[PDB]
Design a protein around this ligand. Sequence first.
Ligand SMILES: [Zn+2]
Lengths: 98, 206, 127, 155, 60, 140
Amino acid sequence: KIRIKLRGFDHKTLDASAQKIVEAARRSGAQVSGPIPLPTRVRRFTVIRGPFKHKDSREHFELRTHNRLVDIINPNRKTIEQLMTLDLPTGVEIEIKT
Amino acid sequence: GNKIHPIGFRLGITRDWESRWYAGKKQYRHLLLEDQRIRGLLEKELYSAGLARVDIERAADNVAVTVHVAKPGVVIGRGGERIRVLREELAKLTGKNVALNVQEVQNPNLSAPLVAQRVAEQIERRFAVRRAIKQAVQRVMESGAKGAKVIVSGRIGGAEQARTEWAAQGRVPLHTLRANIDYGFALARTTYGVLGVKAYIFLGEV
Amino acid sequence: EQYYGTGRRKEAVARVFLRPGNGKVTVNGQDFNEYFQGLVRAVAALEPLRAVDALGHFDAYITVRGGGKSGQIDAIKLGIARALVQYNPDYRAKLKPLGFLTRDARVVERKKYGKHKARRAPQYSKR
Amino acid sequence: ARRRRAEVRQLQPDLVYGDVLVTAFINKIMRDGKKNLAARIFYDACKIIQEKTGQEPLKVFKQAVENVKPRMEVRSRRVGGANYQVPMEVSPRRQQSLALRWLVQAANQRPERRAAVRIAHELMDAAEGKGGAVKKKEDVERMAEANRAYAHYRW
Amino acid sequence: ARKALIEKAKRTPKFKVRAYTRCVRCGRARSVYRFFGLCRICLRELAHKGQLPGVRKASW
Amino acid sequence: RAGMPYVNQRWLGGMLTNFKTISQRVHRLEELEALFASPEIEERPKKEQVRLKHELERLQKYLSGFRLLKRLPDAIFVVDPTKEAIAVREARKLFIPVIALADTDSDPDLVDYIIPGNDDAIRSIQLILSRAVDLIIQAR
RNA sequence: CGUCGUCAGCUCGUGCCGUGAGGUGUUGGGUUAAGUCCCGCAACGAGCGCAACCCCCGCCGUUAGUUGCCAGCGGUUCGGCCGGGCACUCUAACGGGACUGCCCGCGAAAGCGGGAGGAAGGAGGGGACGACGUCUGGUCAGCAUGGCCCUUACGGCCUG
Ligand SMILES: [Zn+2]
């Protein structure tokens, strides 16, 4: 009945962090839902390469955010207290829901 | 011509972002702006030290600045006075209690920014450009470095007309992704204008 | 009892289940003659059935999603072919030559910068 | 093309009649990508033909197809900055292509208000041996073997 | 990008619809982006440097 | 049927005068054939492996037998000193003795030790070479 | 940054030929999208380029099942709405698969024409990727910048 929402730019570190979250939570007794991949959100920026003119240059950039979900069921006192303690990587952002 | 930036080409693979933090649309711009301020301050301050790279990280209203320097002795000094006052200055810039770290680069001949900086210094010291480039390329190649290349922009030795000098040695495959090419640019401000020194170092594969 | 095939065509996806019976086909809780009304090519979707002289035994339950009508038609065709191959594995010996087991892979080309639409270039005159 | 020889696209046979040439004609009628509308026009015309002409519409349609099949085209050759109309023998591929085309323009050139009626009338007339399409084909034919003098420029 | 103009757009211009946005790096007023606060040129430059986290060259 | 090297595909221009440049090719061949028999080839996707296989095939085809030369040879054996004129000239330039199975259409002067006989007629080649190889084997 | 131009070119090391500048390679035949390969040949290799390494789409596996999904069953206000499952579609990670690899003929070989098999067959479709250089090419009005000039106006506010 607790939801773990993970966001980040780099998917390697996000996947890694989700792995530790789910593993540690599993070791503390009750059932784990499992890492749920949610659809990524992509922003596109199209900018003229040239600084003055040549409007047909058009370099493309993308900024993509990834999403995860963990959804721990039957929260133990140990499960919760051991959680909200593990330090996040440099990128990964976490949200706790009921 | 018009080659693209060899780093921006390989950001996903074989290179890593200098800045590693996440922020929503709400606070992205503010964090980036303060990041730019930090980078500018550290560029201005730690020039003589032999700076190569600045890394920024964020966890929770926390900043972990990491500075790559050829000579950390210059950075720290006696009893870590300079590093302490520098931490104080950075924290005064942004109320987030930044945690400054200093790393020494192994064999500073294998850092493209450093090579470009040194050659730019030599140009500003009115050295002969061609000899300087040749010596720099040879120096890099002696320290492993399966390939090296150095370019100087133009306006050589106060001559009226500008011209590119250019010198390479070994393999510099700019087209292959798994190349691990280190890139460094330095601007040399001289009495007769400005010169642009570029350095590519092909350091292994994959 | 049930034989299942997927099939895909140009952003359209189908799911087809084949069952024994009198051969009544239904699509998205409707009739194949109701969902595809007035579309001439619609019958083509059922071609892989009558190839094996089916359409008299197999009732089809189809749930289809995405793309435009023709997209669902081709998706249904490929799905039916796959389901039939599952039902009678030797059908592959005869369904393959008539071009039923191939998944047509031609999709929309992305628009390119400096061009109107992906191939067409802006007109210029007085060269 | 300077290397390849542009493999002819193999059309899909029609569903109603089980014919490829029918599909070619349907495609030739089609404009602005509306296939369903074009097929409706063709089938409407076919039923009108069946109404006004006893036998099968497919037979009449095919008959018209060969009745508007030329065998002698004129090709422009640039010799000494002058255009030479060399007679040539149109390949069966080109024969069918030109037949279907000319049939379509001839049909659409008619004064009848509705498209299906125009298609039916053109097909019927071309089957008979008269109309715009057959006239155009005859004109093209007679254009050749009239500049036979100009046929030594092989091109 | 006169220093005066840059220093002027940083206040409350007596009205809401008088204020506008400028590139925080070069003071350009033309083609800035809300998400970044940079003009197109600075955006390209910083994106190439690798100083924008999770911003990469797109190819779909 | 000896420790002796051989060249029977094509005499590359500079096998002897440009010996080091060919030793580079020998090193490349040995390192390639070591890599192919290595548990490191799980990388380099299939097309790269195909390219490497093609390269190794070519190297094995051309420099087979030449691999046994750790250094310059102390002699040479030529079947036809006119067909293999380049080899003979290279051997002359470096002060290497020349042995040839010369025939009517050859210049005897360029050959130090000469066997005036046939260069066609497989039987003639067989007899001469078999005798020479047997003498090599026995006198070891 | 544009452009020739994603055109296929630009060179170097050693060897060899020439008194020498220089040549060879890099020419010739075939083939290719390509200086891409094969053969011939005093050349044998290499570097920057082509290609490949990267991304998207096309087929299939696993790992995962919420906010996405509903084949079977039980509810059902007819709504996947409920309980259920997560099989299927899908979402997003990691791999597999295609390499003329396998048969038939042909060629000295590169390769060519057919044939299974396969989702895809000979570059599978698209993108990113732009050599030495050319254009006194474009931009002192993105930014930086040497020189010259104004500094009660060529600076800076305000209304129209
Ligand atoms: Zn800017």
